[PDB]
Amino acid sequence: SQAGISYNTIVNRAGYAPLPISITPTKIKLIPTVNLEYVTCHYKTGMDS
Amino acid sequence: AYVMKSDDCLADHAEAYKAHTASVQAFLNITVGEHSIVTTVYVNGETP
Amino acid sequence: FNEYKLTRPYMARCIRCAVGSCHSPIAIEAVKSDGHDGYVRLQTSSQYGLDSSGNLKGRTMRYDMHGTIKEIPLHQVSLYTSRPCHIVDGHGYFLLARCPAGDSITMEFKKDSVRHSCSVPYEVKFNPVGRELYTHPPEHGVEQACQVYAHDAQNRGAYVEMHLPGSEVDSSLVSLSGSSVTVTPPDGTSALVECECGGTKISETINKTKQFSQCTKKEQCRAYRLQNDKWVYNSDKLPKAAGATLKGKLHVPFLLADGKCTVPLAPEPMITFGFRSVSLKLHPKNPTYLITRQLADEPHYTHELISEPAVRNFTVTEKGWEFVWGNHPPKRFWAQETAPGNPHITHYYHRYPMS
Amino acid sequence: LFNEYKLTRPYMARCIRCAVGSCHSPIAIEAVKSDGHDGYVRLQTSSQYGLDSSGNLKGRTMRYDMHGTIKEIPLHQVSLYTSRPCHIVDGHGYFLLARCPAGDSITMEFKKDSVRHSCSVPYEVKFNPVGRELYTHPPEHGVEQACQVYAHDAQNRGAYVEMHLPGSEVDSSLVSLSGSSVTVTPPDGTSALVECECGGTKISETINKTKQFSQCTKKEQCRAYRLQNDKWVYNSDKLPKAAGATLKGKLHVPFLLADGKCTVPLAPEPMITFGFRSVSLKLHPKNPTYLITRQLADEPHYTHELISEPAVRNFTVTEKGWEFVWGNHPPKRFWAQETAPEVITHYYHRYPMS
Amino acid sequence: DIQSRTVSSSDLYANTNLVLQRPKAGAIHVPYTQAPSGFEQWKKDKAPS
C-alpha cells in the first residue's frame, strides 16, 4: 500500500510467453462509515425583557 | 434568561461523528500487455 | 427587502456615555468577533438603512433622543476598539465594521456641541487565518479558506424577534400649573399617567391635557407614554408589556459565510543535511507554526511557535518525515545511508545500531 | 529651489484597507522606515508633498491623483497613526517625515468634504531607544547621547531614488456608447491608445479625436488606454511599465538618518553598601535599565541584566577590580583593600586555604 | 545578507533567499518572501561590545 512505487510482475505460463503487469496505485483511500450525533456551536444568551 | 444557538451556526458548526467499518478504496493505473486502464477498485473480498 | 420598516429604535443603558452611565441612543448589545480577518458584527439600539420617517435612505443611522427618531450619516459616526475601526456597512439594528483587537468597543458621534458615546466591555478578537499568526494582513500571499462576516444582508437564514414595546416613562409630560398637576401628551400619543396618595388613578388621556387635583407635587404622578404602534426588539434594557409581546421576526444580516482570504507565506527555510538528521535554519517575519511528524506508528508530532530566528536539529529515519512551516505545503523527506565507514570500523554501529 | 520633483507626477496605487475594502488609493504607502532611534519615521508615499497641482512650489500641501487629475490638500488635514496618532513634521517629494510611535501598521488618511480616503499597511514601526535605559517616550530631562535620527533637512546627500516613464494608464470612462456602437471620448487635449478587438484586433493611436470605433457593439470588448508622458514617475511595483528604455533621472531622497545628540534618561543613583570584598547594591529603577558588570582581571565574569523592578544585588570585589555601569551613567570602578575581621579567622579570610 | 567592499562602492553581494510569488487575481504587484535583514537582527541579538 504505497503510492508512486510502480509495482511490476510477470505471469509465467509454460507454453506461452511472459505477460508483464505494471500496477501503479495513485491514490489509496480509507473511507470510514460515519454516524452524526450532534452539532455544537457558539451560544447566545437570550434575555427576555 | 435562556440559551440559544448562534446565528452563524449554519457555517461555523462542529460535527460530531462516530466512525466505524472503513472501506479502503484504491485508484490504480494498470498496464497488462499494452492495454492500459485506470480504475477505482474496492479491497473487499469479492468486489471485482 | 427591508420589510421591518415598522421597528423603531430605543434608548438603552450604557456604562459610559462620556460622563458616567447614561441611557444612550447608540447603545450596544452584542459584538461578534467569531470571524477571521478583523471584521465584526455589532447590534445597536440604533437602526441603519432607514430615515426618520421610514423611507429607504442609504448609509445613515437613526436613533431616538427622548421621543424622536433623528438621523445622522455614518461618516460622522466613529467606532473604535483600541485603534479606530472602519465601518463597512449597516442594516437594521446590525452594523458591520472592520475592527482591530481590544478589550472594549466604543461608539461615538457628534451633535451640536454634544458627543454621544457608548463604550462597552467586549473582547473584540482578531482571529488569524492559517498557521501564520499575524495581526494585520499582508499585501500578498496564498489564498486559504476563511469564514468572514460578509457584506450580504439578505435573509441567509437566521432571524431575531421584534416584540411590542414597553410603556416609556416621561417626566417631561407633566408640570405643575399652578399648585395642581397637569399632564401634556405630545401629539395625540396617549398617556397612562398613574397617580397615588389617596385616589390611585388609572388614566387614558387620549388627545387632551387633563389636570389632576388630589396632587401637589411632580414626583407623585408618573406619566407613561403609549405608542404601541412601532415594534421593538427583545432588549434586556426595555420593559415589556403584559399580554403577548411576540409580534414578528427580523432577519439578521452579515452572517458568517465562506470564501477565501489571502494569508502570508513564510520565508524559505535553509535545510542542511546529515546522517539521520535534518538541520533547519528558520528566519520568520511574523510568528509561525512549525508542525513536524514522522511517518510510522510513533509519529512524534512536534508543534512549535517560532517568533525569533531558530535552529532545529531534527532526527530523521528511513521510515519518513514531514515538515510544515507556515502556510507552505508539506515537504516530505526520507533518509539513506552514508554511515561513517567502509565495510570493505565505525560502520554497522551507525547503520543498524545496537550491535 | 531644490524641488526638481516638479518633473514628476502623483500616482495611484493599491493597498489592502481603504475604509471600505481593497481599492486603488491615492495615498498608498510603498515603504515605511523606522531604523532610526526616537520614533521618527520616513514614509514613501504615492503622493508628493511640497507642491501644487500646477507644479509651482508651495510649502505644506500634498498632491495626489484622483482618477486622472491632480488635487491638493493642506498638510494640517492629513492624519496618520500606528497604534496611537502620529504627528507630521515635514514632507518633501514622494517622502513624508513623521513622528510616529510603535505599532504593527500605519494608516494614513484624509477627507474631501464627503469622502474618507484611508490606506493601511502592515509595515512595522519600531521605537529603538538610545542608551541603556529603555523608554517608550522620552523624558523631560536627562543627559545627552549620540544618536541617529531622520533629519528635517531636505537636501541632496548622495542618496537617490529612481525615475521612469509611466506606463499607459487604462481608463473606461472614455469608452461610451454614442450610439448603437462604441465611441471613445478622450480627455480634452491628450491622446489615447485604443486596442479593441471585437472581431479582428483593431488598434488606433488617436492624437486628439473622438473616433467612432464601429463593429464593436459593447464597451466590455473595448478597452482604452491613456498617454500622458509629460511627467515622470517612481519605479512602482503597483504600476505597469512602458516598453522602451525608461530610466531617466535621479530624485534625491530627503530626511536621511543623520547624527545628533538626543536625550537619554538618567537612572536613579544606586544605594551602594560596602563590605569585606563585597559590594551590595540596592537599585531603584524607573524604566527598564541594563546592569553591566565585569571584573578587571583575566576572567571578567560578565553580567548583563535588565533590571525592571526593585532589586538587590550582592556582587564580589577583589584586589584586582570591579566595574559598574547602570543605565546611562558613567562607569564606576571599585577595588578592595585588606580588612579581614581567634586569629585564624583573619587568616581564614585574608589569604584563605590556610 | 549585504556585503559591499566599502561604503561608496558599486559592487554588492546579496543573498537574501529571495523568492518571488504570484500576484493576486486583479492586482498589479511584485510580491516576494525574503529572509529578513540580519543587520536589524544582529542589533536585536548582540552582546555588549
Task: State the main characteristics.
5 chains, Spike glycoprotein E2 (chain D), rod-shaped, 49 residues, part of a larger assembly, mainly beta
* Oligomeric assembly: part of a larger assembly
How far apart the termini of chain A lie comes to: 63 Å
According to DSSP, the number of beta strands of chain A is: 3
Looking across the biggest beta sheet of chain A, what order are the strands in? 1-2
Structural class of chain A: mainly beta
H/E series of chain A, N to C? EEE
Outline of chain A:
rod-shaped
Biggest interface and its residues per chain?
A-B, 30 and 31 residues
Largest sheet report of chain A? 2 strands, antiparallel
Q: Residue share in helices of chain A?
A: under 10%
Q: What percentage of the residues of chain A does DSSP assign to strands (E)?
A: over 45%
Instruction: Give Rg of chain A in angstroms.
Output: 27 Å
Count the DSSP helices of chain A.
0
Note down, in words, how this protein is organized.
Chain B: It is a single-pass type I membrane protein. This is part of a larger assembly, with five copies of chain A. Chain A is mostly beta strands and about 50 residues long. Chain A contains no helices and three strands. Chain A has strands at about 5-10, 20-40, 45. Chain A has a two-stranded antiparallel sheet. Chain A is rod-shaped, with a radius of gyration of 27 Å. The termini of chain A are far apart. Chains A and B meet through β2 and β3 of A and β1 and β2 of B.
Outline of this structure?
Chain E: This is Spike glycoprotein E1. Chain E: It is a single-pass type I membrane protein. This is part of a larger assembly, with five copies of chain A. With 49 residues, chain A is mainly β.
